[model samples]
Target: MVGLIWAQATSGVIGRGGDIPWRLPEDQAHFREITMGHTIVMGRRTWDSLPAKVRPLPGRRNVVLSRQADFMASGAEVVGSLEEALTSPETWVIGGGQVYALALPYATRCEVTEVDIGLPREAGDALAPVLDETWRGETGEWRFSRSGLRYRLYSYHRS
Candidate 1:
């Protein structure tokens, strides 16, 4: 199944500059729990944004979508399109905004955590693809986060 997974907040912002704006330890745990064994496809910037210590997310196959034909993601397979990324038996569309824009349509399920932070416009925070009304999804009960933020795990399947 093709699925989308990420942690974002009410602002629709998924990233600031090249990294996410909020730090939710539970959200990180949640992210690792879901994508552990899947083929994760992300944009070149997303791969670059990963910490040098964990440059390549371990235990999963990483494919990077980059327009740069000569770009080589150190530990990932470079693919030019989302279609190629979905060739795996099970694929997880992870992101930077542009990658999500391309893969959201092909996603069957979406797992997201809506955190309680809003990023400033001047910070270069980027928005993920809007799932809006065409998708009907359910939100899990809200939970108190370790970071003093309130968030929920939302699961959505395209309607």
Candidate 2:
């Protein structure tokens, strides 16, 4: 199954410049919980934005989609297209906005962490992909993180 996992602020912003705007350790924990041992495919930018030490994301197989034919990401297999990246079994599509849009049609499940903070339209560079009616979502109660950030998790699957 292909699952899409990400965190976004209330403004629908997923990233600021090259990284996520909020600091929520719990969301990070949630990320690790869902993706461990899965094959994760991300766009080149997403791979680049990761902290250098966790580039390959530990136990999972990391695949990066890049237009550059010769692009090589250390500890990751670089593919030129989303089709090639999605070939792996038990795949998870991690993102940048463009990658998420491209992979949405192929995803079976989506896990989103919605943070309470909001950003001005120009303050963020990447927005979360909009999910259409084909997906049925279940949202949990909102709660505060260690940093006092209000957030909630939403799980969606094809209807």
lDDT score of residue 38 within candidate 2: 87
Candidate lDDT values, in order: 0.85, 0.89
* CA-RMSD of model 1: 1.5
The clash count of every prediction, one per candidate, is 0, 0
TM-score of each: 0.92, 0.96
Q: Over 4 Å off in model 2, which ranges?
A: none
Error of 1 at 81 (Å): 1.3
lDDT tens digits, residue span 1-159, model 1:
998898887878888879877789998888888999889999999999988788689999999999888997888999887788887788998888888888877887889888877654555676767886778798999999978999998898874
Q: Where in model 1 is the C-alpha error above 4 Å?
A: 120-123
Q: How close is candidate 1 to the true structure, as a TM-score?
A: 0.92
Worst 10 residues of 1 by lDDT: 117-126
In model 1, how large is the Cα lDDT of residue 58?
A: 92
lDDT of 2: 0.89
lDDT of 1: 0.85
Best by lDDT: 2
